[PDB]
Design a binder for this molecule. Structure first.
Ligand SMILES: CC(=O)N[C@H]1[C@@H](OP(=O)(O)OP(=O)(O)OC[C@H]2O[C@@H](n3ccc(=O)[nH]c3=O)[C@H](O)[C@@H]2O)O[C@H](CO)[C@@H](O)[C@@H]1O
Ligand SMILES: CC(=O)N[C@H]1[C@@H](OP(=O)(O)OP(=O)(O)OC[C@H]2O[C@@H](n3ccc(=O)[nH]c3=O)[C@H](O)[C@@H]2O)O[C@H](CO)[C@@H](O)[C@@H]1O
Lengths: 420, 420
């Protein structure tokens, strides 16, 4: 079981290159099940979630591999299996995205129903419901969501009652091959949804409104292929900007997208940080100052992203003053708080809210990671805490961050991967 | 990684012997740190939690082992180490109970601060707070809760603002050796607390009011030793009564305690079960009938116990009608719902409430265990579901149930433990 050994107080400063969004690459890879011609994806991060997706894709008949240039070449021209197996699905619930394109293109699909997840209740009722409105017959047999449709899907008006990133993407994917026009009202607006829509359009789709709560899709017979550069990862960017904010350092993020982090950037400024945004980079200079506590409320884009919640919890735990953190997306995503309390942090939880009291310094000790995106807060804490910190079960971190040790070391952090 | 293979529909009927309460044996074993003379505990279940406690106890200088008769012999006359190490504490947060007796008897103690736990936020602020009111100086250093006191503790009035089983037990333990009298208002009333108090009294303690919200303890210089038979486990009993209730069978639980399951028994009757209570046994006969849905609201004893919540969720998922399950103890203890949904169950979660719709039959498939007490619901589901069911990560089950496969097989269930 790999662990991270991170050392005493450090000023995190320097340059770091931002990779493509994990959550844009993932849905794009599943959407690729629709491509009848070669696909070439660039700027795809190198982390476990991508590898798992490739394993699922390959067992469907898709030929896909990353070459020496780092680009992902994919050929889905001969899919001959239409099931995403339980053995793989259980490791990454996002694989539910395989159902939509499979049934839209091949009129049948099967995916293991995602079970429980630590961070909260995550049913996929909205995905099923949306596909059913497009004309799909779906049943649950032996733990598998089985979808079938006698003819091409049929576009129609669809109002998702809850703001859902996943459901918005499943429905949109399926809608690209449906007969007529589909309209997704109350659609999630996340930047990854915009990128997937742009990807599909480059292959012949006709999607407009992506980024808004009103999506319009004019179905087509089939999609071809394309080359696509994945949109910069706003969460990785936010995470590194936070690295400087919590250490009083100065960090420059390269290859960023200016407008996908407004909520995060505003909070960093509210906390006392100076941030400079150029078309392709973002620089945060904490001017060697301690952060000022700021309240946080997670919500769908463009509001504050839940994937940046833990990162900001850490910022608040070392800031000056008291703050209120409210999580409205996943009601049980505070696992990092008690791990941070072990390091000297001060906070109290009540429902979906946490009230933190900032402290001057954290102290190193052993802590456990459990959330692929949120747990990064523990590694960051190790970088600014006194003495030594041991972050166990970092395999979670490897699912949501590429070359995390190299990128952090590049900012002055003393971190080494070991086992035993 | 061990898993359970359980087979198709079965009527669970027969006799099963109930063991001592895991949660009475655990606090009693930590309370034993106070004993200056030999201790002999009988009716102690054989499950992982006991083994972990013994490992912690042994590294303190306590000589303790279960003999061939199954009895646990303990000698804490020569404790020479006063730290419960992170390596052990992280596997069972209940080890926090080691701090109270250590500081009360040796005036110093050290225990790793429990980190995060899947089922919910579980701080121990009340334990620390209570010990501090008794005269202990406590600090958090390098992830360890360090307690110290220059002289014997001093008894005083203590009002725990929240109903807490753990805090009620830490404070009571420490109070037995404090100077003067301690009064614990708003104390938790659980049967295991009554049993621990009876155990301590047999060693010279002077505790009255256990079982009520008002505990009175007259401190003494030192405690001696005794022989004690652990109180029957109400949760294991409830679990087996439920086995019959969900399968229309008839089960007889031997060596039970009549009055520790009133809430559970009433709900079973509300659900259509016939239950006969004798001084030493409880029999549930479902008369081969399907259960009638019943609402559930968890709360401190004598209300409905959270440790029986999943078990009843399963009962509701196969009952007739709709039900509302509200969890007020641990807000994130519904992990079993999505695993049960995979088996054909119907339910929707909203906050700390789950609304279930009973179905006629469940269907076998693979599911994952994650809660030492709650996950037993998944194994039970396997017993009544059609076809085959695979319950993975049963090591959790082994922490909270002794010889679970043997006891279930003894009721007609087809279950086998395997790996790979
Ligand atoms: C692979 C991926 O991109 N994962 C991201 C995606 O997850 P995810 O796909 O789950 O995001 P959703 O926006 O769909 O849903 C968030 C909330 O909606 C609920 N819900 C969702 C679907 C449904 O059918 N029914 C339902 O009740 C969920 O239980 C949860 O409370 O968005 C989250 C919020 O930005 C991120 O933290 C995840 O990292
Ligand atoms: C070893 C053992 O006996 N474990 C049992 C014990 O756990 P446990 O010792 O945690 O029980 P508690 O009754 O003390 O507490 C339950 C609730 O109180 C909160 N709390 C508790 C202590 C504290 O200092 N601060 C605080 O906020 C917890 O976060 C939780 O929400 O009771 C639970 C409820 O019967 C059972 O499900 C556990 O299996």
């Amino acid at each position: 079981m790999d662990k991270f050994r991170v050392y005493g107080q450090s000023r995190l400063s320097g340059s770091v290159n931002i990779s493509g969004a994990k959550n844009a690459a993932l849905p794009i890879l599943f959407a690729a099940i629709l491509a009848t011609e070669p696909v070439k994806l660039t700027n795809v991060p190198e982390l476990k979630d991508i590898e798992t997706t490739l394993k699922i894709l390959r067992q469907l008949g898709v030929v896909v591999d990353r070459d020496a240039t780092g680009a992902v070449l994919l050929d889905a021209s001969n899919i001959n299996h239409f099931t995403a197996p339980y053995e793989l699905v259980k490791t990454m619930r996002a694989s539910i995205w395989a159902l939509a394109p499979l049934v839209a293109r091949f009129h049948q699909g099967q995916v293991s129903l995602p079970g429980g997840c630590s961070i909260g209740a995550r049913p996929v009722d909205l995905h099923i419901s949306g596909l059913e409105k497009l004309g799909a017959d779906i049943v649950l047999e032996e733990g598998y969501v089985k979808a079938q449709v006698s003819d091409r899907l049929v576009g129609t008006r669809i109002v998702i009652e809850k703001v859902s990133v996943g459901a918005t993407l499943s429905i949109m994917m399926a809608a690209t091959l449906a007969k007529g026009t589909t309209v997704i009202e109350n659609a999630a607006r996340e930047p990854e949804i915009v990128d997937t829509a742009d990807f599909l359009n480059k292959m012949g789709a006709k999607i407009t409104g992506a980024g808004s709560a009103h999506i319009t899709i004019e179905g087509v017979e089939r999609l071809t292929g394309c080359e696509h550069s994945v949109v910069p990862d706003r969460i990785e960017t936010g995470t590194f900007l936070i690295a400087a904010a919590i250490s009083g350092g100065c960090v420059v993020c390269q290859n960023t997208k200016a407008d996908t982090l407004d909520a995060v950037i505003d909070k960093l400024r509210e906390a006392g940080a100076q941030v400079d945004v150029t078309e392709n980079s973002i620089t945060l200079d904490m001017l060697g100052n301690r952060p000022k506590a700021v309240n946080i409320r997670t919500a769908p884009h463009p509001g504050f992203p839940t994937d940046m919640q833990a990162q900001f919890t850490l910022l608040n735990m070392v800031a000056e003053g008291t703050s209120i953190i409210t999580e409205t997306i996943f009601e049980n995503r505070f696992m990092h708080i008690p791990e941070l309390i072990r390091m000297g942090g001060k906070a109290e939880i009540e429902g979906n809210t946490a009230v933190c009291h900032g402290v001057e310094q954290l102290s190193g000790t052993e802590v456990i990671a459990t959330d692929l995106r949120a747990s990064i807060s523990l590694v960051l804490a190790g970088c600014i805490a006194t003495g030594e910190t041991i972050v166990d079960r970092i395999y979670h971190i490897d699912r949501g961050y590429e070359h995390i040790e190299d990128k952090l070391r590049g900012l002055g952090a003393k971190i080494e991967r070991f086992s035993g």
